[PDB]
Design a protein around this ligand. Structure first.
Ligand SMILES: [Cl-]
Lengths: 388, 388
């Protein structure tokens, strides 16, 4: 198990489901990868037909909450590697689309709507699909969802323009918080759209899974941070790690019922006002980039915040430790096998453990962390209004 | 005067500069508008030449901190009204470009780089321009900045392809926080790229000015809210009001040196986890959208948060009061002359007052609000590294 905890301890503390769902991630990813591998020809044919038909293609990666951050996290990688004049990638939350459809859904633009959902039962998921069908003349869909009996999945069959990519059944997280659903969806999406050769994807997958298991094995390293005196947490990252930070900090908010206040930023963005949030009771964690160029900017920022000596702790997740003063460096090293976009997986596993253990520290029940009932596993109170 | 305060009172409190710069906004905006009026034919001709040469044009709206939020706020409006296959609008912070230039700056894409800066002395401003010039074959620039002797402005002369649009000198805010600088730059940008007829823009400008004066006249109303017990502030807004919420919350952070923790979200996004931050010492303010359809989603959310009865106060800025239970409704009514994108101006004045008065409440010196010196008016410690 995790730390010393027995399964019995975890049940008594209301953390068995969430702990199980975090720890099952490498196994879930291997199933997802194998499903990808079996479907890869069909998936590539699907996308190729669209490319053959249309000169400009708007791809919209869309979900709500943690499902929105799937697109946010992967977006900068796709933007780098694709020519925007052909495949124009966007991450637009379902919660944005439902409120302002006209901003995003345009009649004459060929559009591939890539819908993400753990439960499939957020009203905004179906409303976004329905608005897209209403407003876009040439619409295709890729539906990436974990619940085969969720409304999103149920309405995604028998349509030659909708590629349904169900995630493994156990990734339909019963926990309040999305854990294995988030990472499984993100892995599927990266495998689908990453133009890298299959053999390279395979190798990277194996290293992703190895690194993640190492993180899980060393939960005590995360506990060391949890044990510090803090009630604010700030996650920072550049590139894909900006959306990853957004997810990492949300996991805290959610699992501590906001008893820990939070922020996400990039390291370079952080200086321009947001850094004001730091106080003596703040932990700052950086998801480090490993390209030589971008790493330099991370390092200057970590040096500065450590040097300020205000924060309780500055933590840098990277591929190596330089031996920085007043920084906890967490070295997760691939031998360089992984590029940055695949490092999101072990990095978020660390973040999930931090959120889980912090929930336990504050005596919240991670599996059911909103005792007021004002936040819910499946969103409540969403009304869809008719658009004309 | 603001409230009871004399100029000597404000001097004593370290608030004279910021108070002045907020209150000068209507006058600054008229000067900005008159400049635009004078230059509009030249401006249109500049953009028309670009459209005459290139089939696909990438517009990048770029700044750091509050300057980034000019682009974030206006972007959804430009996205709605432009055809993305011709004019493809993006808001990408200078703090993102400098760290990951290859994500955004593409050799073969005709690009219009629209740079924002109050001081012009952020290293990322010049690095962003330099990276664009070194990477993009067909580049044009629009430089919108408040400091004629800032480094950005000073390198923007004598270039046919760089359209320099200096803002009124007094908008080079001496206060730590950007107030009139943000608004002047945002007004100029909207006037440049809004395809509405000039006669309509002039009509709206007059109502903007009038409503903003009314907000300033009624500072006592904001004070009443600031007097409530709270240490967390959440701003919510849809469409342009998401970026505006980002700015509104940053103002609090900056001016209270993080003594008040903050969040920005959209009303519909808020439910999917972020709502967890609410506690009994939290004030939630919503920048209300006035289109019939989107407004319905604001209203559902406000009803819900009010009905939960946890937050200290729920405040809705709009064009009218419906008479909502447990909500403070602030009605700023144009008679319907203003569309939502022009309502950002009166809305942000209200949020500036809220931040300034909260700063006074916590006995910070709003003009110089970082007594640790770890956050600065002009960013310190940014090193620019060579990109290959
Ligand atoms: Cl009140």
């Amino acid at each position: 198990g995790m730390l010393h905890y027995t399964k019995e301890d975890l049940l008594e503390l209301g953390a068995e489901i969430t702990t199980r769902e975090i720890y099952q991630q490498p196994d879930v990813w291997r199933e997802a990868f194998e499903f990808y591998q079996a479907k890869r020809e069909e998936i590539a044919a699907f996308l190729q037909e669209i490319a053959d038909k249309h000169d400009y293609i708007k791809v919209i990666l869309t979900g709500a909450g943690t499902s929105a951050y799937v697109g946010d996290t992967l977006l900068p990688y796709f933007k780098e590697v694709y020519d925007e004049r052909k495949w124009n990638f966007n991450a637009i939350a379902t919660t944005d689309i439902v409120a302002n459809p006209a901003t995003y859904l345009k009649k004459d633009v060929a559009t591939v709507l890539v819908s993400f959902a753990r439960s499939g039962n957020s009203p905004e998921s179906l409303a976004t699909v329905d608005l897209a069908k209403s407003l876009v003349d040439e619409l295709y869909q890729v539906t990436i969802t974990c619940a085969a009996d969720g409304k999103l999945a149920l309405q995604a069959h028998g349509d030659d323009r909708n590629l349904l990519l169900l995630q493994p059944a156990v990734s339909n997280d019963a926990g309040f918080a999305m854990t294995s659903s988030f990472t499984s969806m993100m892995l599927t999406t990266l495998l689908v759209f990453d133009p890298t050769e299959f053999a390279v994807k395979s190798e990277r997958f194996e290293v992703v899974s190895s690194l993640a298991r190492k993180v899980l094995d060393k939960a005590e390293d995360v506990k060391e941070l949890v044990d510090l005196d803090f009630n604010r947490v700030i996650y920072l990252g550049a590139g894909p790690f900006f959306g990853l930070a957004h997810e990492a900090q949300l996991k805290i908010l959610e699992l501590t019922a906001g008893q820990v206040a939070t922020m996400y930023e990039s390291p370079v963005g952080f200086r321009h006002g947001p850094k004001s949030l730091i106080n003596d009771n703040t932990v700052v964690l950086v998801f480090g980039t490993t390209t030589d160029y971008t790493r330099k900017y991370d390092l200057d920022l970590v040096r500065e915040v450590a040097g300020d000596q205000i924060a309780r702790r500055v933590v840098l997740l990277s591929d190596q430790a330089f031996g920085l003063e007043n920084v906890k460096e967490v070295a997760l090293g691939c031998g360089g096998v992984l590029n940055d976009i695949y490092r999101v997986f072990p990095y978020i596993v660390y973040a999930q453990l931090f959120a889980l253990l912090t929930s336990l520290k504050v005596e919240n029940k991670p599996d059911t962390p909103s005792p007021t009932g004002t936040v819910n596993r499946v969103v409540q109170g969403v009304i869809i209004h008719e658009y004309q």
